[PDB]
């Protein structure tokens, strides 16, 4: 199937309480594999998945060097953005960055990414062409000018199309036991009386991986999007995910309703009904 590698980074200032806290995590699809936290005892990038532990000491030394350099860069950039936005030095501010690559079953590059946000709003993003930028405002335009002057996009494109995809291929192989296994959802429907006139039918999907999944209710074969309560997909804590969808049905009309489930671990889409 298709796969992805993504790195996430967050720096948060805290005026009067030391230097900004920096946290970064790396994922393959929905599997967390490395982390680094500046507030940790002895900050070092640490392994979080069995298949990455084989990497040798030079891997961990170099990764750690990079992480530390990103923390310092963010600290300088947080000051820079205070100037760009004519802001006081009294408040807490946030800088976020995500980069990575997506590949198809054949292992070739499908799309690359590199984007930044300031205080939770889009700041600047490398376009899908991996050669041009989208700036959100005149502040981000100042960064764009500097990045266009330093040929930054050229640097990112090289990485994204080369190293990023090659690391992904390597990790997929070393972690094939888990990274290339899709766990299908375990599904069932529950009935919860609301009043003598109605009850909720709740369709459950449990123990699945990866996270992507579609759950829908139909009434007489008609989608009930507007009348369905759909909770966000949530982590179970053991690598797998959970999700449910619910609809309010009048007493005795339970059989007009059907739950539909699509997941990559299922050869055919599922159809379920409440069973008294």
């Amino acid at each position: 199937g298709s796969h992805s590698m993504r790195y996430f980074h967050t720096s948060v200032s805290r005026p009067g309480r030391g230097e900004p806290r920096f946290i970064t995590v790396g994922y393959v699809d929905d599997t967390l594999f490395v982390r680094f936290d500046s507030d940790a005892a002895s900050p070092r990038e640490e392994p979080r998945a069995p298949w990455i532990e084989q990497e040798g000491p030079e891997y961990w030394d170099r990764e750690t060097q990079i992480c530390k350099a990103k923390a310092q860069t963010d600290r300088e950039d947080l000051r820079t953005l205070l100037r760009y936005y004519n802001q006081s030095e009294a408040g807490s501010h946030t800088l976020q960055n995500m980069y990575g690559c997506d590949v198809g079953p054949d292992g070739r590059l499908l799309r690359g990414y590199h984007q930044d946000a300031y205080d939770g709003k889009d700041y600047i993003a490398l376009n899908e062409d991996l050669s041009s930028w989208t700036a959100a405002d005149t502040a981000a335009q100042i960064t764009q000018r500097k990045w266009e002057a330093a040929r930054v996009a050229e640097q990112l494109r090289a990485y994204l199309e080369g190293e990023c995809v090659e690391w992904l291929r390597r990790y997929l192989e070393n972690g094939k036991e888990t990274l290339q296994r899709a766990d299908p959802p375990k599904t069932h429907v529950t009935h919860h009386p609301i009043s003598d006139h109605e009850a909720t039918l709740r369709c459950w999907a449990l123990g699945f991986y990866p996270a992507e999944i579609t759950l829908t209710w139909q009434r007489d074969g008609e989608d009930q999007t507007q009348d369905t309560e759909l909770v966000e997909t949530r982590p179970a804590g053991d690598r797998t995910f959970q999700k449910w969808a619910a609809v309010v049905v009048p007493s005795g009309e339970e059989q007009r309703y059907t739950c539909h489930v699509q997941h990559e671990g299922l050869p055919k889409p599922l159809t379920l009904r409440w069973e008294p």
């Binding site: 790195y7 860069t73 990112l156």
Partner: peptide, 9 residues
Amino acid sequence: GRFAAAIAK
């Protein structure tokens, strides 16, 4: 493995 070039805003 991460991208290693430092790029100041």
